[PDB]
RNA sequence: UUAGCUAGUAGGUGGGGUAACGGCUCACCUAGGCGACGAUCCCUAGCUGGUCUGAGAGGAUGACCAGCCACACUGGAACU
RNA sequence: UACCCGCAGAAGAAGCACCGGCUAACUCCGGCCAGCAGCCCGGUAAUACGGAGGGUGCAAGCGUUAAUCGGAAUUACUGGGCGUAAAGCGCACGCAGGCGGUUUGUUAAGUCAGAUGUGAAAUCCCCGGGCUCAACCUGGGAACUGCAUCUGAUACUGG
């Protein structure tokens, strides 16, 4: 019921944090073609639960560091 | 071009280069007459065109035409130039007659405002 | 902001009577109407398309005595209004105050009608209106002021108008020197020798 | 009682041993004003003879146009060698918004309201040929209705 | 390779109409059958039949009126390289309403006026004039 | 504080005031929160020159918004006439 | 005709700090982070509602009016 | 002050550009010179130079210059091309990227529908109102083609 996002984890080398890439399908404003656009977010991953490739559901929260403002909700698909 | 080729590199609007770059988007520019001389036309035509070289206030040094019949213009004369080329290759500006050093063409009765001639009072 | 020079020159150039004179004579007895003005008036050169459009626009303008800025604004408003642009333009031209005063019979010419209006001698709904371009609306009542009813200009104009045709949208009483603007004239009520589409094409190019 | 209109007069020349031989070509268009229009093209060593030949060729070779209350049925595109032409039906009161040759064709054809535009080369001969080809390929609701084997409820 | 079979069906129809072919055959598909249904109910083709089980073959019977082509123009609008979707208030009308525009709305493949009456938009499959 | 006042629009010598609810620090014709009416001081008495909503005005006054003296007189005259 | 950039740099624990979250700051640890969807570097530039033009899509533009931002001789700093 | 009233007398008030074609407007007079020219005249009867007469267009303005868009479909998304006019890499393999045969099920990301919130006022547009008309001011509406959220649809694209 809370507004959230969904993307795949592209990096988990940092501790308690992951980098999730939110891919979106946007129509080109001029030529009308539907192009892919990637939004990479630094997400807070406590317990280090997410590996590379997991399709995770994230939500926005207060700033947790210089670049982290999103936190993890749950993992949908797990790197396989 | 394919829509994808345009997505990757859009259309590049052709940029138009000015024909009077020494004015710098100004209608008129002031300058001092460096050298007053005459020039011969090009091919078909045959005359002795009255022209002058003028260093403008922005540092540009350009050759400017002196329209009308007869002119009293010497070196160090501070005139006002405007756009408008002479078809005399190289000359791309005209001297405003009646502008602070260039007296109007004497004995003008028609198209006086184009040559800075006061209206002859009856 | 006014044309003060020769009047019959305009009608000679347009090749058509523009009613620039009162009507004590025929224009044929005052000028060579069938000959264009000037030294080279005997010649008639083949007019271009732009020539015909310009000449029709100038004929309408010189008929109504309207300069170019006001006529351009008239065309702009007519193209803005809904319907056909040409009849809108002619209705906007006929709605003017000096035009109505002339058509009402208080002016021998539209120039003297404009002089009557401008000199504060014409009332609209009891209010003295001295604007020649004043748009007269339906049901408006136009009358000569008490002070100007004594002028022989209005008498001669009344007589000269009685010898003219009567417009269908004007209910005028020559005794009270007053009239009523009943409605805007339809396209079929004005002159049939005026091609509005020429003006529309000239102003839409 | 059809209307005839001279669109363009052009002076062409052929060279011979003695020098240049100048002749004149005239492009005209005729039409009855309610859906029939035809263009003629005549070459002659003089201008009035060229115009006469053009008028005789234009009085024959006339096509039929399926008009719709004095305007087009639908937006049409006409194409000849270099000229590409676009015509579009307008509402009542707009007039003919078209170039010279297009104006002549659409005016003698009977079209009163149209928004037109000429692309490519504006050659008068090719422009009038493209306009005629676009107007004759324009079909009416009855034509498509009878060609589809269903009533004309699309109108 | 074959990356647009719907444009291939339209091209087969156009080429069979220009060559005065009596009928055109092609590999069948659900979308092809839906578009052929829309074309037949609008009166652009006579009939269509799907033959075969493991490799269905769709056969459209082309239509002529005066020895002339019934389908004057048929174009692919939405294509793999550029998809075109329209809302119900901006659905296109071909030939100022005399032609049809095959639209794929959430309630199946239908014409543009049927999608307008149904208050629907979707992918503009093709224009048939 | 939040105040309900007039913003002098119109032409020269023919003022037309818009009764606006605005933060009192902004400029006269500047940023405002909500327009709650108008006031034409040179009305011909043939037409209306006082169409200020009293519902939202009372709602804002209930929230501590201040009423300027001219707007207070306008509210008084609107209540008397209606 | 700028392809690599970054050491408080990215994150974590703890102390401090702020009205408030936060490398905002410090100690330590981990070795990361940004980048071909143009990072870095260079030139130009106040942003918007809007204005002009255009059938439209667009192109140009950001004076007046209104909103936001920045500046107050130049550089720095805090006090109330 | 606006506005109104009285006085006197046409009395205090018309200029600028252009006229070879494009482009509305033509004759006379003075040597490739003087000069004009936005793009295509003048070497001794120049509608193109300069003057005069006449005319044309605007008009308390008129022209020139500078600048933007249009015309320019002349950066072509709408809406262009590449044999010879400018344009197919000398040829191939191939990563990223773009696209992808056919059937079923599922999802509802793209797509579509509805609703809510927002999209400041002014400006643009429509119907009226007040300035003697207009400009201008102004009431109401439409518009702001956008974004987010929620609920559904499942034909097509995607997983």
UniProtKB/Swiss-Prot annotation, chain B:
Disulfide bonds: none annotated. GO terms for cellular component: cytoplasm; cytosol; cytosolic small ribosomal subunit; ribosome. Changing residue 87 to Q: Confers low-level resistance to streptomycin and a 15% decrease in the translational elongation rate. SUPFAM superfamilies: Nucleic acid-binding proteins (SSF50249). InterPro entries: NA-bd_OB-fold, Ribosomal_uS12, Ribosomal_uS12_bac. Keywords: Acetylation, Antibiotic resistance, Methylation, Ribonucleoprotein, Ribosomal protein, RNA-binding, rRNA-binding, tRNA-binding. Signal peptide: none annotated. It comes from the Bacteria. One of its GO terms (biological process) is Group I intron splicing. GO terms for molecular function: misfolded RNA binding; rRNA binding; structural constituent of ribosome; tRNA binding. The modification N6-acetyllysine is found at residue 106. Part of the 30S ribosomal subunit. Contacts proteins S8 and S17. Interacts with ArfA. May interact with IF1 in the 30S initiation complex. Belongs to the universal ribosomal protein uS12 family. At least 19 substitutions or deletions in 11 codons can promote streptomycin resistance, dependence or pseudodependence; all but one of the streptomycin resistant mutations (K42R) are associated with hyperaccurate translation and thus reduced translational efficiency. The streptomycin sensitive allele is dominant to resistant alleles. This is Small ribosomal subunit protein uS12. The gene is rpsL.
Curated annotation (Swiss-Prot), chain C:
Changing residue 50 to D: In rpsD101; suppresses a temperature-sensitive mutant of release factor 1, R137P. Not a ram mutation. It comes from the Bacteria. Keywords: Antibiotic resistance, Repressor, Ribonucleoprotein, Ribosomal protein, Ribosome biogenesis, RNA-binding, rRNA-binding, Transcription, Transcription antitermination, Transcription regulation, Transcription termination, Translation regulation. One of its GO terms (molecular function) is structural constituent of ribosome. GO terms for biological process: cytoplasmic translation; DNA-templated transcription termination; maintenance of translational fidelity; negative regulation of translational initiation; response to antibiotic; ribosomal small subunit assembly; ribosomal small subunit biogenesis; transcription antitermination. InterPro entries: Ribosomal_uS4, Ribosomal_uS4_bac-type, Ribosomal_uS4_CS, Ribosomal_uS4_N, S4_RNA-bd, S4_RNA-bd_sf. Residues 95-155 form the S4 RNA-binding domain. GO terms for cellular component: cytoplasm; cytosol; cytosolic small ribosomal subunit; small ribosomal subunit. The keyword Plastid does not apply. NCBIfam families: PRK05327.1, rpsD_bact. Belongs to the universal ribosomal protein uS4 family. This is Small ribosomal subunit protein uS4. It comes from Escherichia coli (strain K12). The lineage of its organism: Bacteria, Pseudomonadati, Pseudomonadota, Gammaproteobacteria, Enterobacterales. The gene is rpsD.
Curated annotation (Swiss-Prot), chain E:
Keywords: Repressor, Ribonucleoprotein, Ribosomal protein, RNA-binding, rRNA-binding, Translation regulation. GO terms for biological process: cytoplasmic translation; regulation of mRNA stability; regulation of translation; ribosomal small subunit assembly. One of its GO terms (molecular function) is structural constituent of ribosome. It holds the Pfam family Ribosomal_S8. One of its GO terms (cellular component) is cytoplasm. Transmembrane segments: none annotated. InterPro entries: Ribosomal_uS8 (IPR000630), Ribosomal_uS8_CS (IPR047863), Ribosomal_uS8_sf (IPR035987). Signal peptide: none annotated. HAMAP family: Ribosomal_uS8_B. NCBIfam families: PRK00136.1 (NF001109). One of the primary rRNA binding proteins, it binds directly to 16S rRNA central domain where it helps coordinate assembly of the platform of the 30S subunit. Part of the 30S ribosomal subunit. Contacts proteins S5 and S12. Belongs to the universal ribosomal protein uS8 family. This is Small ribosomal subunit protein uS8. The lineage of its organism: Bacteria, Pseudomonadati, Pseudomonadota, Gammaproteobacteria, Enterobacterales.
From Swiss-Prot, chain F:
In addition to being a ribosomal protein, S16 also has a cation-dependent endonuclease activity. Part of the 30S ribosomal subunit. GO terms for molecular function: DNA endonuclease activity; four-way junction DNA binding; structural constituent of ribosome. One of its GO terms (biological process) is cytoplasmic translation. SUPFAM superfamilies: Ribosomal protein S16. GO terms for cellular component: cytoplasm; cytosolic small ribosomal subunit; small ribosomal subunit. InterPro entries: Ribosomal_bS16 (IPR000307), Ribosomal_bS16_CS (IPR020592), Ribosomal_bS16_dom_sf (IPR023803). This is Small ribosomal subunit protein bS16. It comes from Escherichia coli (strain K12). Belongs to the bacterial ribosomal protein bS16 family. Induction: Part of the rpsP-rimM-trmD-rplS operon. The gene is rpsP. Keywords: Endonuclease, Hydrolase, Nuclease, Ribonucleoprotein, Ribosomal protein.
């Amino acid at each position: 019921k809370i507004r959230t996002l969904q993307g795949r984890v592209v990096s988990d080398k940092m501790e308690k944090s992951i980098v999730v890439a939110i891919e979106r399908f946007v129509k080109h404003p001029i030529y009308g073609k539907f192009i892919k656009r990637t939004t990479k977010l630094h997400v807070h991953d406590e317990n280090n639960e997410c590996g590379i490739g997991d399709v995770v559901e994230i939500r926005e929260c207060r700033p947790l560091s210089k670049t982290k403002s999103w936190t993890l909700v749950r993992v949908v698909e797990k790197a396989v | 071009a394919t829509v994808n080729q345009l997505v990757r590199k859009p259309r590049a609007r052709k940029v138009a280069k000015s024909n009077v770059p020494a004015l710098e988007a100004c209608p008129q520019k002031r300058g001092v007459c460096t050298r007053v001389y005459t020039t011969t036309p090009k091919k078909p035509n045959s005359a002795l065109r009255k022209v002058c070289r003028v260093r403008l206030t922005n540092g540009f040094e350009v050759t400017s035409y002196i329209g009308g019949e007869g002119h009293n213009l010497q070196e160090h004369s501070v005139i006002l130039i405007r756009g408008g080329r002479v078809k005399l290759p190289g000359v791309r500006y005209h001297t405003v007659r009646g502008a602070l050093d260039c007296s109007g063409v004497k004995d003008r009765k028609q198209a006086r405002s184009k040559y800075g001639v006061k209206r002859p009072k009856a | 902001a006014r044309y003060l020079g020769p009047k019959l020159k305009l009608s000679r150039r347009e090749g058509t009577d523009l009613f620039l004179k009162s009507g004590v004579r025929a224009i044929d007895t005052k000028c060579k109407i069938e000959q264009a003005p000037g030294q080279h008036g005997a010649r008639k050169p083949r007019l271009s398309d732009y020539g015909v459009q310009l000449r029709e626009k100038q004929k309408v303008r010189r008929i109504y005595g309207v300069l170019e800025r006001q006529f351009r604004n008239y065309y702009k408003e007519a193209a803005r209004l809904k319907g056909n642009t040409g009849e809108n333009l002619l209705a906007l031209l006929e709605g003017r105050l000096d035009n109505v005063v002339y058509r009402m019979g208080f002016g021998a010419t539209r120039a003297e009608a404009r002089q009557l209006v401008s000199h504060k001698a014409i009332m609209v709904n009891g209010r003295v209106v001295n604007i020649a371009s004043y748009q007269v609306s339906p049901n408006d009542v136009v009358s000569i002021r008490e002070k100007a009813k004594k002028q022989s200009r209005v008498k001669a104009a009344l007589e000269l108008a009685e010898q003219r045709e009567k417009p269908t949208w004007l209910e005028v009483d020559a005794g009270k020197m007053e009239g009523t603007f009943k409605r805007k004239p339809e396209r079929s009520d004005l002159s049939a020798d005026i091609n509005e589409h020429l003006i529309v094409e000239l102003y839409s190019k | 009682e059809l209307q005839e209109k001279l669109i363009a007069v052009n002076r062409v020349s052929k060279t011979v041993k003695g020098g240049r031989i100048f002749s004149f070509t005239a492009l005209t268009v005729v039409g009855d004003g309610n859906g029939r229009v035809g263009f003629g093209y005549g070459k002659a060593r003089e201008v009035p003879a060229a115009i006469q030949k053009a008028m005789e060729k234009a009085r024959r070779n006339m096509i039929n146009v399926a008009l719709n209350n004095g305007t087009l049925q639908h937006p049409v595109k006409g194409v000849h060698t270099g000229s590409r032409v676009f015509m579009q039906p307008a509402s009542e009161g707009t007039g003919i918004i078209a170039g010279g040759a297009m104006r002549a064709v659409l005016e003698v054809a009977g079209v009163h309201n149209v928004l037109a535009k000429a692309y490519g080369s504006t050659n008068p001969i090719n422009v009038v040929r493209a306009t005629i080809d676009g107007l004759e390929n324009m079909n009416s609701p009855e034509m498509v209705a009878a060609k589809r084997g269903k009533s004309v409820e699309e109108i | 390779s074959m990356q647009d079979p719907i444009a291939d069906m339209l091209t087969r129809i156009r080429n069979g109409q220009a060559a005065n072919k009596a009928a055109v055959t092609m590999p069948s598909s659900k979308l092809k059958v839906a578009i052929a249904n829309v074309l037949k109910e609008e009166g652009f083709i006579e009939d269509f039949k799907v033959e075969g089980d493991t490799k269905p073959e769709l056969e459209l019977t082309l239509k002529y009126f005066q020895g002339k082509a019934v389908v004057e123009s048929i174009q692919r609008v939405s294509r793999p390289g550029l998809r075109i979707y329209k809302r119900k208030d901006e659905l296109p009308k071909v030939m100022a309403g005399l032609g049809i525009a095959v639209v794929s709305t959430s309630k199946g493949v239908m014409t543009d006026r049927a999608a307008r009456q149904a208050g629907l938009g979707g992918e503009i499959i093709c224009y048939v004039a | 504080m939040v105040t309900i006042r007039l913003a002098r629009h119109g032409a020269k010598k023919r003022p037309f005031y818009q009764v606006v609810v605005a933060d009192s620090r902004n400029a006269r014709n500047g940023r405002f929160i909500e327009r709650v009416g108008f006031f034409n001081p040179i009305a011909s008495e043939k037409e209306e020159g006082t169409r200020l909503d009293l519902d939202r005005i009372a709602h804002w006054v209930g929230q501590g918004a201040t009423i300027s003296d001219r707007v207070a007189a306008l509210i008084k005259e609107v209540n008397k006439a209606a």
